[PDB]
């Protein structure tokens, strides 16, 4: 039950990505440290093991989406891919923040114990940026209002997920151990 090393996973990504050295080091070390944190589960001498998410930045067509997809092939824990452009501030017509967790369970076949150990990716984060330049009465929803909702999600807390496509049964799913890119 030997886990992969940063060098082994890096060579695996080299066969699908070209011209990106610094970005490979981040995902390799983060994914490597992820397995160690979940494997220990505050059972070793190290108590209250923290978390470290990743923020990828680059021009369009640079290969950000490729690293998220190619990484999932070698990855054992599940993986998903969503977009925050459609997200709203808990009640508007567009979407809800918990939709991300719904797509995550489809890949894990509704396994809460296995989904918490998974990985999540977000695309088109620039659309969430402040729109109104020190906002006014309009109460921006697509922008600032979305960031504040994600705050608790990235840190870790319980949530609510529909079991089979609802919008009277809700399952609790922690997110402190879940990684976000």
């Amino acid at each position: 039950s030997a886990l992969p090393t940063p060098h082994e996973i890096r060579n695996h990504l080299d066969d699908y990505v070209i011209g990106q050295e610094q970005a490979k080091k981040v995902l390799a070390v983060a994914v490597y440290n992820h397995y160690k944190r979940l494997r220990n589960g505050d059972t070793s001498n190290g108590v209250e093991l923290g978390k470290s998410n990743i923020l990828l930045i680059g021009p369009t067509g640079s290969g950000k989406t490729l690293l998220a997809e190619t990484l999932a092939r070698l990855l054992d824990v599940p993986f998903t891919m969503a977009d925050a452009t459609t997200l709203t501030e808990a009640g508007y017509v567009g979407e809800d923040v918990e939709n991300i967790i719904q797509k995550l369970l489809q890949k894990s076949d509704y396994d809460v114990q296995k989904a918490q150990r998974g990985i999540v990716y977000i695309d088109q984060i620039d659309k969430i940026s402040r729109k109104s330049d020190n906002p006014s009465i309009t109460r921006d929803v697509s922008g600032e209002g979305v960031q504040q909702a994600l705050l608790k999600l990235i840190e870790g807390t319980v949530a609510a997920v529909p079991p089979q496509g609802g919008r009277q049964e809700f399952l609790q799913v922690d997110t402190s151990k879940i990684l976000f890119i």
Partner: protein
């Protein structure tokens, strides 16, 4: 041309002209000759500030060589009518009518710059026509001269006979002499 400035507020940024920015702080500018158009504009500003805040002092900067008398008297009654104390400052020069609005300010809130100069004289006029019409306009301009001296004594504290003798001809008063004359209260040499 007038430069534009940006004011930082909680709601957002706002572009204001240099004159409109100062107006928001209860500051009025009196520049050039006193005429019917410029005087009617200052009255609207004073009335607007009265409604916005009746307990805050107004700042009135006076730098003008004087002008029409009737245009200036409309401002004098307005300053005395409204409740707020209209603070007056003399910048550059203060002629006959410019000086009258300076001394007409609230008592104790009148200042003059260290190099300013005040000038006071009698009303100017003229007429051309029949002798009967000259007598009518002559009696009228004489009443104005008498009325302007009565009010000048009221704010300056001097006697009516003293103001009459000094206003027969042009009389220049430097900034220190204006304090001794009761026209102003002090000088704003430096900031404290």
């Amino acid at each position: 041309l007038v430069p534009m400035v940006i004011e930082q507020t909680s709601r957002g940024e706002r572009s204001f002209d240099i004159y409109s920015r100062l107006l928001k702080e209860r500051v009025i500018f009196l520049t050039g000759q006193v005429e019917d158009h410029m005087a009617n504009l200052i009255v609207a500003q004073m009335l607007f500030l009265e409604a916005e805040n009746p307990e805050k002092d107004i700042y009135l900067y006076i730098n003008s060589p004087g002008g029409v008398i009737t245009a200036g008297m409309s401002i004098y009654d307005t300053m005395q009518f409204i409740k707020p104390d209209v603070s007056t400052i003399c910048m550059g020069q203060a002629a006959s009518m410019g000086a009258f609005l300076l001394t007409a300010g609230a008592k104790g809130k009148r200042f003059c710059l260290p190099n300013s100069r005040v000038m006071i004289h009698q009303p100017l006029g003229g007429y051309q026509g029949q002798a009967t019409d000259i007598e009518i306009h002559a009696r009228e301009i004489l009443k104005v001269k008498g009325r302007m001296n009565e009010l000048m004594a009221l704010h300056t504290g001097q006697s009516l006979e003293q103001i009459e003798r000094d206003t027969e001809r042009d009389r220049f008063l430097s900034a220190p002499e204006a304090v001794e004359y009761g026209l102003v209260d002090s000088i704003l040499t430096h900031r404290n």
